[PDB]
């Protein structure tokens, strides 16, 4: 099992520092070496730092050279990235990658993790449980839902029931509004449930400690 | 830093069917040393991006004949030859033969299944949102194929209005569907002033649209 | 940038009729070298402009004996001698002997015709309307001559109203009539408010107006 | 055969940038100054640009002065019209012209793409079926139409019987209501088809591609 597992990331204002970092296992972790890579906003992927196994030559593109750093804590497996003067092009998820024995293209990607860099204050989300009202009438089944508004950063988690519906759920994509995302997760479920029993979805906001649950009641 | 186009932006491809992405550097790939390092990566969704292709021609191991690399210098193909339905994801070439590194911008794989309407649902905005001075009615079209779909808000009929959000899914995994949701926001008042809201959908599986509406009021 | 006025902007002439346009400049035209670029232009109905007679007067190519361009120095005329259905349409004069270019306001050549009365149709509100909740009651003036029409919406006794949609038709080709397309649009529950919806023509070829109607109840 | 087409017009938010281009054809280019023209809303007509044939020196009158300039490729066979700042006083039809040999006057139009510049969105028609009520009447000829309400921006194709039913049918103008488009079109068959014979009437809007058909049902 080769696993490369990031840590770090976090939402920093537009020219704070903060050090990112990655542990490694299931492989020999000085024979290879090991960068860093972002994934923005529109999906494009940069690499951003390449360090040799033994940590003497180290690599960077223009735009972080000089305000990031790459770090390889090899007795303790630890591989860091120290950046500063984050400017909002380095908001993006970073993963942690390995190169092959042949130290010019990757093998393998950790989980990643996120930065978001904006001055903008993290804000808990307001969670609104949407009943069906409509037209037309019920039968064979039912589609009910909860408009998770307002919130930063990103991410919020949702989950119907606690986990133990997962049968027709989506949860769509958050788009921002004024510095301030709104999602909202559909679910169905047959007719003869919503009423008598019930469906509840349960909001966690990581960046707050915020945790909702809204029943969806008629 | 070497440009790598990549085209298509998307390749709707049948499940039984070969696909072939292409991939082109500005400058050449062909290292002087023996040769290229041009890679195939693939990012099935929510997932971390895997290796399927390095030095243009050899799978990575798990990697099943059926994916096969291909070119030299500067343009570069990669060939799915029949396609299965995990294969949905964003493929980038990347090379690295010269520093720094660069990817391609990405070719999204897109399974295509037959036509599936839209399941449209509409909700009146919840008391608890009203109370605190706003209104969201969100209307959900859920499970559909194709992606486009064009949807309109109709306050009191006439009211076509502009003030709303928008969302879709990627394909889903499952059943190479799409979910799209939207979303009009407006304040107590302004809801308040009228009576009858609309989510109106028009999507190639129906020649008429499908139109779902409530009236803010009916007792 | 000479400012050309063109008199008349409308034109019945029977068949037959010669048709005299005149197109005067707030400025000199007249150029000493070469007397003047003036130009005519016709814009038949749905076509681009062709030009008709160039240098105030010289036929282009294919343009009849019937066109012939007279005037000099700052006033010119177009005379269109036995005027045929074919050349309905708007004139523009323009100058080109200065800068900015400058084109006129246009003629619109309308062929007389024996009068008619207009074929009228009245429409309520689709159950498909209604239901994204508005309202729109439609009546057809079709096939008429000449162009004055007055279309008075009555719901419910002698009680007109404020919101209605009129466009006509331009001259119609072979067959020289109008037509006219009058819809009114209320929301769905003022429709619901009321039960006589009466589209009511006037027009010269009648004293009594042409009263088209329905009562608000299928049944 | 003088042939000369634009192509390139379309829905441009007030501030925009466009580029329409024209090729010309079946004469020779380079011998030919060029033009284009435009056609506003109240049909008035408007000279907007001049190359001489070499394109070596551009006239433009004074509303357009600065903000658009005119092309032209005596290779490839190319006019255009480079429009930035778009303001909405630039909504109209342009055409793109031939100059005679004293290029002075214009002696070949060519068919014109149309320009909208509005802050509104692209939205697809609805249509209603216009099926007889009316004060009753089974004549000889039966009127039915449909209606194409809330679209934008032009232009809609209404057909009827996908063409094969062609005879009197009237497509009057569309207008504007608030910000949108609406326009309806009559048909008239005889009173014996038009039950016992489906008619349909279908509209295209191009700009969102949609293609709806109506059947007129009683
Ligand atoms: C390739 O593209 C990049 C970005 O446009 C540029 O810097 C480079 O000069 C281009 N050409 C070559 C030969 O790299």
Redesign the interface.
Same mark, same amino acid.
């Given at each position: 099992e080769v696993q490369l597992v990031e840590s770090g990331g976090d939402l920093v204002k537009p020219g704070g520092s903060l050090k990112l970092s990655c542990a490694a296992s299931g492989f020999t972790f000085s024979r290879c070496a090991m960068s860093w890579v972002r994934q923005t906003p529109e999906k494009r992927l940069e690499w951003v730092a390449g360090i040799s196994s033994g940590g003497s030559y180290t690599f960077y593109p223009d735009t972080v050279k000089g305000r990031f750093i790459i770090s390889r804590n090899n007795a303790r497996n630890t591989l860091s990235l120290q950046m500063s003067s984050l400017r909002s092009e380095d908001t993006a998820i970073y993963y942690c990658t390995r190169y092959s024995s042949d130290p010019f293209y990757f093998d393998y990607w950790g989980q990643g993790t996120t930065l978001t860099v904006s001055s903008a204050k993290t804000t808990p989300p307001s969670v609104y449980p949407l009943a069906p009202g409509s037209a037309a009438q019920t039968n064979s089944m039912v589609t009910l839902g909860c408009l998770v508004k307002g919130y930063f950063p990103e991410p919020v988690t949702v989950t119907w029931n606690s986990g133990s519906l997962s049968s027709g759920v989506h949860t769509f994509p958050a788009v921002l509004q004024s510095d301030l995302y709104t999602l909202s997760s559909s679910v169905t479920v047959p007719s003869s449930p919503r009423p008598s029993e019930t469906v509840t979805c349960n909001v966690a906001h990581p960046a707050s400690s915020t945790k909702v649950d809204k029943k969806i009641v008629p | 830093?070497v440009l790598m186009t990549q085209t298509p932006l998307s390749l709707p491809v049948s499940l039984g069917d070969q696909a072939s992405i292409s991939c082109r550097s500005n400058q050449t790939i062909l290292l002087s040393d023996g040769d290229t390092?041009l890679?195939w990566?693939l990012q099935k969704p929510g997932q !971390?991006?895997?290796?399927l292709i390095?030095k243009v021609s050899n799978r #990575?191991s798990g990697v099943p004949d059926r994916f096969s690399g291909s070119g030299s210098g500067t343009d570069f193909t990669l060939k799915i030859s029949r396609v299965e339905a995990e294969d949905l994801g964003?493929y980038?070439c990347?090379q690295? !033969?010269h520093? *720094?590194? %660069? #990817?391609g911008?990405?070719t999204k794989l897109e399974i295509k299944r037959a036509d599936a309407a839209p399941?449209v649902?509409? #909700?009146? *905005?919840?008391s /608890?949102?009203l109370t !605190?001075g706003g209104a969201?009615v969100?209307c #959900?079209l @859920?499970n559909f194929y194709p992606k486009?779909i +064009?949807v309109?808000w109709?306050i $009191?009929?006439? /009211?076509?209005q @502009?003030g709303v959000? @928008?969302?879709?899914?990627d394909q $889903?995994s499952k059943d190479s569907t799409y979910?799209?949701?939207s %979303?009009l926001t407006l304040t107590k008042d302004e809801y308040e002033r009228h @009576? !009858?809201? %609309?989510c /109106?959908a %028009?999507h190639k599986t129906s020649?008429? *649209?499908i139109?779902?509406?409530? +009236?803010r009021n009916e007792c």
């Open positions: - | 830093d390092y890679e990566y !971390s991006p895997k290796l390095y #990575f964003v980038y990347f690295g !033969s520093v *720094p590194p %660069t #990817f911008g990405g399941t649902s509409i #909700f009146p *905005p919840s /608890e949102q !605190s969201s969100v #959900f @859920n486009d +064009n309109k109709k $009191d009929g006439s /009211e076509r @502009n959000l @928008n969302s879709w899914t $889903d979910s799209m949701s %979303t @009576n !009858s809201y %609309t /109106e %028009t020649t008429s *649209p139109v779902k509406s409530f +009236n």
